[PDB]
């Protein structure tokens, strides 16, 4: 009876909108009892089966639906979503393209197709397909919010205010109707949403994990209440899909091996397979135990292994980023679960007990922004492995080509030995900076850069062109190895002016907004002999930024763009800039560590979100309170002063140059000891039985 099965199929659609997925599944199947050949019920059922993570069972029904109706457009589109979640992008494209073939005005299919182009880096095509979907279905929250992020990625500030209005309007309506918001938690930091809306957005994405774990019907775990089974050692589990060539490893790859084995037994749970890099190699060897959970796709079994290792503190290092398997935390295999480092924001979820932060990043007055309890680190929660990865940048030398410290720079492990082979090396006391005069040796190095040569030899020492590290040693270029040659870095390599202030920002473009660019324009107008240095990410955003800078009165030559470089070249070429202008909307957390390691001052204006306060937290730990702006006017004044008071710039540059070593910012050994003290506070608190409480102290 297709008529009764139709009633059940419509009722299931209604229950499906209300979030009652279990009942929707029960109603779709009942419709399939009344009407076995119901192609619509097969497809709708497969959709909710996909929501519950039962992807293989969903595909089976999608194909059953398409066997019944070979021209079922909705089935191909929905099946495409299941294949994309399965990482089969070619299969998803073929499904999406087949659906749009059957129904040229299939708004959902165009939006889904646009998602592939977005994830592929084909932003212009994603924009085109999202606009097509909105042209066919102007009321399309998914297509609008993802289109809004595409425009954010390319810095297209076209009708920005109105676009923000509609975004906030869409989230408020979705939060009011208990629907999953179309704005991603990671992206919410970029839009003028209330802190309540941001946490609510997170809270509902954290609840999605339950839909995938409730069908597992697993009982709660029994957690250890003492350290007797682990010989008095606290068992700490680090879960991350980024144990490899990923920024997170570039920050904390030394921490596992630096844990005190007398008090701690470190477990590293990879959610990703081995990518063959030394980062992965290092963590697998220095951790007491390395568990590749990518081999255990089922969260139930994977959660069992975590609990069966006796973990006391489980650390979430992904949040809502790619590769995250938060379902493992929704099952609570560990008595204490904490967010740390990986994700700049609240989980908004129940299972996460703590979030590891600091007083500067997350002052107590904004406790309402987070679902977790605040667990303060002593200075800053952030950390980087720069001291271990890029030691050749601990010292530098320059070439007096006329004394600048960022026009022609020499770095190397054997730098002093090479300088000791030269008879005319001068020193400028600040650690003091050695200067090479414009002699025969100096002309030889300059000749290499202009001629584009890869490297030369002087007094037996190899002198490498900074632009050609990959051709010399690819391991050195990715930061896997330390470059064994003396590297030359010149402003001339990147078209930077030799006699002008260079304000830089190597952050991704989506972190810039119209207000931020306006600040930078005000700074450039006030410092005439200066230019802005930006990263081509994505390259199609370069023309967008220029046009707006052009509207604000800045010629196109005042904004210099460089391509994305290898890790080592990115961190090393930061030495060429005078100042770093941080992005207030969302701070460059890893980028700030790279810039600070190069001895480049960074100006920042901490906002209210966690992502907007990391830069201020790093400088507070570094000991440079004069680079933290309380409002936009102070942000510009601080930047203009560094570009026009060259004596003040020299003082502030030497301050960062010294304190990057003397302050705890890059001291991973100290950071690990402080993190261990914090871990024990959490366990001592758990030993008493107290519920997770704030560790602000």
């Amino acid at each position: 009876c297709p008529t009764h099965a139709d009633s059940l199929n419509n009722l299931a659609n209604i229950k499906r909108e209300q979030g009652n997925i279990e009942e929707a599944v029960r109603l779709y199947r009942k419709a399939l009892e009344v009407f076995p050949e119901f192609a619509a019920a097969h497809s709708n059922l497969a959709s909710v089966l996909q929501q519950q993570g039962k992807l293989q069972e969903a595909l089976m029904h999608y194909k059953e639906a398409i066997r019944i109706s070979p021209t079922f457009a909705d089935a191909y589109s929905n099946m495409g979503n299941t294949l994309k979640e399965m990482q089969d992008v070619q299969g998803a494209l073929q499904c999406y393209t087949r659906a749009i073939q059957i129904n040229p005005a299939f708004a959902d299919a165009h939006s889904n197709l646009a998602s592939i182009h977005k994830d592929s880096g084909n932003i212009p095509e994603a924009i085109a397909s999202y606009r097509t979907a909105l042209k066919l279905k102007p009321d399309f929250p998914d297509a609008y919010c993802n289109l809004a992020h595409c425009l954010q990625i390319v810095c297209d500030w076209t009708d920005y205010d109105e676009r923000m209005k509609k975004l906030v309007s869409i989230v408020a309506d979705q939060l009011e109707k208990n629907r999953l918001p179309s704005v991603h938690p990671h992206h919410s930091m970029l839009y003028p949403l209330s802190h309540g809306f941001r946490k609510a957005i997170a809270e509902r994405h954290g609840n999605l994990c339950l839909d995938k774990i409730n069908v597992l019907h697993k009982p709660p775990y029994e957690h250890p209440k003492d350290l007797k089974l682990s010989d008095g050692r606290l068992r700490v589990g680090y879960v991350s899909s980024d144990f490899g060539n990923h920024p997170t490893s570039h920050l904390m790859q030394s921490i596992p091996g630096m844990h005190n084995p007398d008090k701690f037994e470190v477990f590293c749970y990879a959610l990703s397979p081995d990518d063959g890099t030394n980062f992965r190699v290092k963590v697998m060897a220095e951790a007491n135990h390395f568990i590749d959970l990518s081999q255990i796709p089922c969260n139930g079994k994977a959660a069992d292994r975590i609990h069966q290792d006796g973990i006391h503190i489980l650390v979430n290092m992904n949040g809502y980023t790619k590769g995250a398997r938060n379902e493992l935390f929704a099952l609570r295999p560990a008595p204490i679960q904490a967010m740390w480092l990986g994700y700049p924001g609240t989980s908004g979820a129940l299972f996460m007990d703590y979030i590891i932060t600091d007083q500067e990043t997350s002052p107590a007055e904004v406790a309402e922004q987070y679902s977790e309890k605040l667990a303060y680190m002593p200075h800053t929660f952030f950390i980087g492995d720069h001291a271990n990865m890029f030691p050749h940048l601990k010292k530098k030398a320059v070439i007096d080509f006329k004394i600048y410290d960022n026009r022609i720079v020499l770095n190397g492990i054997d730098l002093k030995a090479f300088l000791d082979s030269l008879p005319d090396v001068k020193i400028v006391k600040m650690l003091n900076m050695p200067v090479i005069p414009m002699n025969t040796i100096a002309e030889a190095v300059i000749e290499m850069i202009n001629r584009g040569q890869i490297q030369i030899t002087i007094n037996g020492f190899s002198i490498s062109n900074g632009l050609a590290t990959t051709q010399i040693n690819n391991k050195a270029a990715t930061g896997e190895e330390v470059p064994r040659t003396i590297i030359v870095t010149t402003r001339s390599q990147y078209g930077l002016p030799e006699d002008a202030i260079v304000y830089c920002n190597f952050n991704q473009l989506y972190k810039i907004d119209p207000s931020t660019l306006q600040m930078w324009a005000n700074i450039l107008k006030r410092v005439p002999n200066s230019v802005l240095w930006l990263l081509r990410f994505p390259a199609v955003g370069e023309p967008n930024i220029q046009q707006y800078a052009q509207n604000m009165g800045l010629p196109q030559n005042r904004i210099i763009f460089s391509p994305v470089a290898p890790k080592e070249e990115h961190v090393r070429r930061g030495q060429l800039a005078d100042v770093c202008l941080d992005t207030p909307l969302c701070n460059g957390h890893t980028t700030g560590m790279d810039v600070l390691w190069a001895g480049t001052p960074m100006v920042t204006m901490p906002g209210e979100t966690l992502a907007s306060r990391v830069a201020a937290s790093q400088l507070t730990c570094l000991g440079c309170l004069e680079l933290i702006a309380k409002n936009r006017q102070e942000y510009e004044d601080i930047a203009v002063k560094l570009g026009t008071d060259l004596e003040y710039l020299k003082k502030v540059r030497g301050k960062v140059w010294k304190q990057r070593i003397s302050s705890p910012l890059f001291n991973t050994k100290q950071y690990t000891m402080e993190l261990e003290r914090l871990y024990l506070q959490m366990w001592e608190h758990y030993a008493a039985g107290n519920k997770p409480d704030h560790m602000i102290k």
Partner: peptide
Amino acid sequence: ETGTTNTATT
């Protein structure tokens, strides 16, 4: 990983 939209057929 951009999200997608499922279609409910009526």
